[PDB]
Symmetry: D2
Subunit: 481 residues, 4 copies
Amino acid sequence: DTMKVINDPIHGHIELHPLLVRIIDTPQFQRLRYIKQLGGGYYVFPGASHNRFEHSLGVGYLAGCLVHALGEKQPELQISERDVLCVQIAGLCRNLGHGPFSHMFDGRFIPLARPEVKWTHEQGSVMMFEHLINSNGIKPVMEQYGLIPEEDICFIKEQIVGPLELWPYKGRPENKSFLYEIVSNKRNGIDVDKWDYFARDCHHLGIQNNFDYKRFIKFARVCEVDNELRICARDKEVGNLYDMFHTRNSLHRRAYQHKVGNIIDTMITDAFLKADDYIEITGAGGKKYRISTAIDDMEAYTKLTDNIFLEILYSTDPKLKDAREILKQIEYRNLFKYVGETQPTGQIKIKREDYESLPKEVASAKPKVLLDVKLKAEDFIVDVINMDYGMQEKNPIDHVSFYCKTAPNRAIRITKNQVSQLLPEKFAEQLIRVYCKKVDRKSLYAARQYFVQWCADRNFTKPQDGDVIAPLITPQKKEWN
Amino acid sequence: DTMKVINDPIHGHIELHPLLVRIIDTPQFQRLRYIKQLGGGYYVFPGASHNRFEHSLGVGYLAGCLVHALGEKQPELQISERDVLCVQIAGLCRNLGHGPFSHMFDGRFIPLARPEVKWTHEQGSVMMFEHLINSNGIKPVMEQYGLIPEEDICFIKEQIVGPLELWPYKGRPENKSFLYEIVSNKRNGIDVDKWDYFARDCHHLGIQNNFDYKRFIKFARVCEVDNELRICARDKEVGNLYDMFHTRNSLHRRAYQHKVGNIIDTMITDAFLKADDYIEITGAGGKKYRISTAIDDMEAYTKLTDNIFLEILYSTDPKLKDAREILKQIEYRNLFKYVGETQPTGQIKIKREDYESLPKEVASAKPKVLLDVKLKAEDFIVDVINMDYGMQEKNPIDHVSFYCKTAPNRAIRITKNQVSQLLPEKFAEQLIRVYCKKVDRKSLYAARQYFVQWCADRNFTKPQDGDVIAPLITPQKKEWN
Amino acid sequence: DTMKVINDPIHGHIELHPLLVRIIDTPQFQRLRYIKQLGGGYYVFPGASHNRFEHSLGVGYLAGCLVHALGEKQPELQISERDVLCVQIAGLCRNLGHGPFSHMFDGRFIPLARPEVKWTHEQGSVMMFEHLINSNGIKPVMEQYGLIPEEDICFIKEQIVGPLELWPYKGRPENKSFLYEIVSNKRNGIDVDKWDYFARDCHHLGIQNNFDYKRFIKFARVCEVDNELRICARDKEVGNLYDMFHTRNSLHRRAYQHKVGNIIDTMITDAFLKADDYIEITGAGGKKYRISTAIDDMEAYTKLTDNIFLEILYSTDPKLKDAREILKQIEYRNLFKYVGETQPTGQIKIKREDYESLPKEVASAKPKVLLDVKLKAEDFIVDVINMDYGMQEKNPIDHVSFYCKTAPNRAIRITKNQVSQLLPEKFAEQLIRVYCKKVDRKSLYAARQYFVQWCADRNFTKPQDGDVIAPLITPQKKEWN
Amino acid sequence: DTMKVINDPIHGHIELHPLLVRIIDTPQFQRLRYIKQLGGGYYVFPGASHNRFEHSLGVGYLAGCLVHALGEKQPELQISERDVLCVQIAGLCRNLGHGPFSHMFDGRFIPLARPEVKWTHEQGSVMMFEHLINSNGIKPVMEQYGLIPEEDICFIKEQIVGPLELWPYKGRPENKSFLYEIVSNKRNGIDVDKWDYFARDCHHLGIQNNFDYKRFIKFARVCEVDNELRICARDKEVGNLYDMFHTRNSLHRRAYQHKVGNIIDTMITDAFLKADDYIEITGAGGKKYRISTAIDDMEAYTKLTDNIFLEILYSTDPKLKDAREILKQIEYRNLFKYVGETQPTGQIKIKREDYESLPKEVASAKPKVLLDVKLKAEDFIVDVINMDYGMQEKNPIDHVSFYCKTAPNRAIRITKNQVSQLLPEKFAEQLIRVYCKKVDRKSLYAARQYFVQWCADRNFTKPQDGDVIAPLITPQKKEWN
Ligand SMILES: Nc1ncnc2c1ncn2[C@H]1C[C@H](O)[C@@H](COP(=O)(O)OP(=O)(O)OP(=O)(O)O)O1
Ligand SMILES: Nc1ncnc2c1ncn2[C@H]1C[C@H](O)[C@@H](COP(=O)(O)OP(=O)(O)OP(=O)(O)O)O1
Ligand SMILES: Nc1ncnc2c1ncn2[C@H]1C[C@H](O)[C@@H](COP(=O)(O)OP(=O)(O)OP(=O)(O)O)O1
Ligand SMILES: Nc1ncnc2c1ncn2[C@H]1C[C@H](O)[C@@H](COP(=O)(O)OP(=O)(O)OP(=O)(O)O)O1
Ligand SMILES: [Mg+2]
Ligand SMILES: [Mg+2]
Ligand SMILES: [Mg+2]
Ligand SMILES: [Mg+2]
């Protein structure tokens, strides 16, 4: 067979190798046509209808482009068509593990439905890749095009999820180390997945992005670092890398962590939780699985898509009413109402174990105002969001290697003070959002007082609309002045 | 009640009136989030993931733009905010009647499922609009914002479907006739819907459009024509208008009538015909409807979306196997194979009543060549496509009124000979595409000989790859050399 | 040393070879920064400030892209780095011959200043290329990077103007004929220069471009045709090629032949004509040249740019008053007034030998209207414009070779009846624009009556606003009624 | 006299009022077609060919847009056609005072040619506005359209340059204070000029901008502050505002302060300095001026554009040799060579005067390494660049008024800790770039040793390629390991 050409609005005409086509034309991959990239963001940004499928295509194409560029600039690295096909495949397949509504599923649902297990979309991706390989007879096709299934499949999996366990990888030796920072870079977070979602998400949201990945590619080289071969970026591009991480953060604050989009994620998740017992998904040899257990059999997970949302919505079965009314309340646009936003202070970090107590703290309060309605802990929703640069408290650029024009083979490091004084002093922070499930005017007035007083009692940041929603409470805190 | 801001990637930030917001936040409208704009096009153009929802938002915005501009340039027309709201609503609601996969439903499925009925997505839009209004108590909100729920609802329905029924309209008098040319122009085909889908479809498909609607709005005026006040375009813009229809014709040949997209639409349609009997949709008071009858109950139709595709695909019920396997053959990318394209010659035109008798002609052929297989009528698929400028054999520009710079109130006509000699001399044509349901190396050869000999015997145009795929048949037709 | 990366808004980051950098950094090439692409178009389309310099970079980049793509898809053609460099240089240098305001210089000025010579910007490009090579010591630099100046310079010049003379080219043998179809296609007109100016001009004008050159490149092959190797496009792309020429025609009708832009070009040409005697340019060895004679000495021509305009405008010499006053009339926006447009009918074609006699025909007209003022031939300007598809009366795609999917090396022809019946049946046409040098309302009124009466007497088409600007004249014409 | 429509690639079709057309069509305004926006930036970014003319149009359009939007949301403000026209004119005319190559003229040339005057394009715009008004008889035209010349012209000037001296303005009273915040905002720097050049510069440079001015406009209100009516932004948009100032800071580091572009600015300034005495420009009543003194007569300044560059490059007079030979090394691309970049720490700030003592310091260093050549202060160029957020050391966001959704009429303040912890803690910084005038390999090597030794001796940051370009010098400073 020959190569297929496909037109992507982001990257233009991309060439696809017959093996990649053979991987694409399977139920396991086509499953991604039915999973939205941004999940509930589509209920806020009407343009964001894009799915994981096209994003996967773009990641594969970009992986191929970067590996090919590095290959043509430096032939001494001995990159083969085999390495290219493999990295392209890893790129194509690192999104196979996503559940319905993407990050809502593994970031919100699974932790609440099955709090005893440890699940990540990466692991879902490796399992679904294995299932994909075996159920469709791919191995002989791999062999036809020059791959060695045992070494190569391993290399692909390690590319997607990291080591499956001194040099920890089995798929490629150290002098091809640079094959491992491309599809999913565990060292600093700079990888082609980000590059594709920057361009796609922006193309669809109606926000435009200032990061030029093609430029970074033009300036990328392979360097010798601590006796291994790593990707080196030209020194003069360090600023751009900072901006790359600034851009990411921006995309989170206007779009990915939008208050309403997130509360819609919470509502869909609660609906799914109240539908978890009554929905049956058919898995291996007829055996029956549930939404929360589908992650344990890939034949079941395969049939787990965004469609579940609609299954609940068009359902007539009375055991599903409680969830169905929630999903109907999304259609009528009767959402939980947003109360406000604040931040922790000092060295205070809201740890995961206390996310469960917070609505009670909010419901306690010491307000001192006409208390015409009482709110109980259940009436409050508290969302804690962690905003970082990809490596928690650390600075990712301290983990990137550079080269200069006078010596393009001398890898060097670059520190923050060498760049600018206008950069951040921190690289992680927490945001706290509070919502009230009671939408009436009196419940809102009250919820605001409870909220602000709660913020005062915890020595948190003063709400931006503090003087507004709580005029009688704000002069309680002397340092908010 | 206040105003909502929406970010659309095509139009930017759009302001939505509380009354419009109220209509949008209903299941009848939100239903459109689950119906893809281009249907089977997403299986060819991976960017085309957009749905009818955002498209509707966009039509609604543009109608308002045009009527508002007309209102500001010529205060003498005394257009009121009420007229504006009615036109905006008409804009929002002219797409409500679409079935699963849009044009596949009313253009392929319904005519084969119900050849006795006359059904259009327009009438469906009217019905679903009535249902939307009634089920959500919109009339009092309409009165609240200054509308007359009797005159106005009528006006909106007439805007979507035309006359119900000199002056055939009842919603607005002759002296506001131009308000009937904005949302759906039955006179010449120039309306805001085309303008939105040009820009949106082009934005997502990855092909770009050369038509500037903002310019057209700037140059649009209301003039008196045959005792009515109609929208007139500036004379020097006639060239642009011809180009507009050329653009429409381009988008069809590249995307909307793509051979593979059309064969996927046909395969899904076939699946739906083979699943129609065994799938029941819950309608009024609990009564059950089938896909082909859902168009007769609006609360049932409400639940008829693309989701139906996945339900069939995830079914375990054996009565759906024959339907379920075809869609599975779409996942594996084992589609009906394209044999070719040809055109009739002289002035013979294929009517709908012969679309059913046509594959028999192709199989009844008597090709003089060493073959290997005999094929039967059931093995061929013949798709007839009508490409026109919107009004069949007519030239739509002969139905546009123009004005000149020196006398901006005097409407004039412009004939084709006054514009260019490089324009088309015909405005309708038929394309015939032939596919074979047998995909083997030898059945394709035969199907090709049948096809070409059929083209010769009916005196059609010679297929572009005629001499290569059927070297032994082409010299029989002297008229191709 | 090594290669330079340059950022272009149209093509992104492009790599430049040291030899190309060396060619670019000369006064002969840098001269193109001071010559506007669209000349007088910038006085109508304020975005069109782009010059010939960047356009040249883009042509070189696209030439290199196409030749590299052909090289990678088909190694059997034996394309070398040397062929690539030569095609890139030819691309970079085919615009070197342009005069001030580009086509105004070669299309309007020179024919009036020196009507005895036959001059084109191509020959100018070859001459300026010879001068560039000799004056900057490029030959030894050419030799260093693996070029053979004797063959190679010839190859480049032939690439720009064709043969300087049974294979007529000496720079490359027949098995490399396809290399002559890239930079300047004398056969059918499909070349990279058009591809760059579509995208650039559209990017700057505020018009959108509907041609995808990257797609065309992806589908380009080298095929065998009549004992030669030609560039061939896939059969399925014939429509896109027609649309390309329609696009070109649209860009001409909207921008390049804009009535006002053309009248500004004409006024500047008059300026240069009335300044020709009084402006002296120092050329080779001190000899002094005039604007109209600079084209015969390249050291003078190097110095011939748009700057001249300003030199005339800032002049204090009373001998330059006549020109300086016309340029000031360009600044105050007192332009010749546009009267109207008409075109011939039947079989009438206006030859160039008759362009001087036309305003006299116009003043010789006898409109039956009471005129307070009489206008003489001196007051009229008549501009005849030839609109074609590049090859006069022929259809250029009758001269492109195609290939089919089943046999990618077998070239075929495709006729117009095989594509569509909605295409043009003619490929050339003439437009006639008439302007009046007298700007007052009464002279305009008069000029219009003269014009329309002339159109009637010559049996031309009726002006679009005929009935409005000449109400008393149009009902005389039997075929306009 | 009617309304004129103009096509701008950034803003689309823009409407220009007959009075605005009359202002635009003057030599004083049209001069801006011949002054590059980014100056020597065009010699690095081949796309940056745009002039200040098409930027001025855009500023006027944006001014009109913002004031009209504010007028439409809040009719209580009593905005008149007169206020809108004045704001538009102010927009159109705030760039009139720009010299050859824009900022290069006022930021580099005048202080070196004439260090005794205080000259800025701000005052120049006012002066040139007066000259335009008087020399072209605009005042009666202003009256024709309903303006009062005496207050209104004052208003316009005060909008461009600020107060011409408790309420300090005379052109408009206290209840219209917000009209002074549109065209040039002296309080915080958020104004429409930035908005136009962000989009334009990005459109042409080949970089994309992530700031959405249309959104800001949609969310802008007039709130009451300290007895003024000021522009208020919605609170939750504060993040975007920070980004705005970040994008600007980005645009400076990538384009406006590009290392090569600045040295090209410096060289052109050098040519002009060595040419100032020998170039004479004709001003008022025949009196003759020099490049540096033309700013003292506006009809002379009128004729002062980028053209002088060419006037110099094209000179044969031996008095111009020193200036003409430098512009020639720009064409040949033999520029001053870049050696490096560094920054001070703590509280050391490079004062404006000591900019002269710096070339002495760099050469005064004593690196103990084999140096083939000794360099003197004249061989060095040291350029100090100030990077800030617009108000030196302060945070402009502490000077913005915000409002809340629940009470849209009371302005509130927002501190940095209320937004995020990921922002800069300083808002101004200095960059130091050092270049060498001798381009040979050894003089360059030496210059590097000198430079790094100077950086070490002054306790500055380590040059990014420090360990590479000067290996024998960096290991001495322990704070660089
Ligand atoms: N005229 C067009 N312009 C731009 N893109 C197109 C056009 N036609 C199709 N596309 C898109 C759709 C696909 O994503 C991609 C490939 O389309 P296409 O060339 O028709 O492949 P194909 O498989 O249908 O034809 P074939 O199998 O005969 O080679 O480009
Ligand atoms: N920073 C942003 N930039 C661009 N678009 C945005 C941004 N934030 C949100 N949007 C989009 C998402 C929506 O389509 C639309 C509405 O945004 P937004 O103002 O946040 O609505 P909202 O309803 O959540 O605010 P609120 O109810 O408080 O007034 O604009
Ligand atoms: N940060 C940037 N982002 C996008 N484009 C840039 C950026 N910086 C410069 N450019 C543009 C300007 C040029 O046209 C092109 C390359 O410039 P640049 O990379 O700075 O080369 P350079 O010659 O100035 O440095 P060097 O010689 O050290 O490589 O890209
Ligand atoms: N077909 C077009 N599409 C897009 N832009 C155009 C087109 N034609 C002209 N333009 C541009 C050029 C101008 O900047 C702006 C307006 O031009 P235009 O409408 O042709 O003015 P005009 O000179 O014809 O006015 P008038 O009606 O008095 O003749 O739009
Ligand atoms: Mg194919
Ligand atoms: Mg809201
Ligand atoms: Mg460089
Ligand atoms: Mg005009």
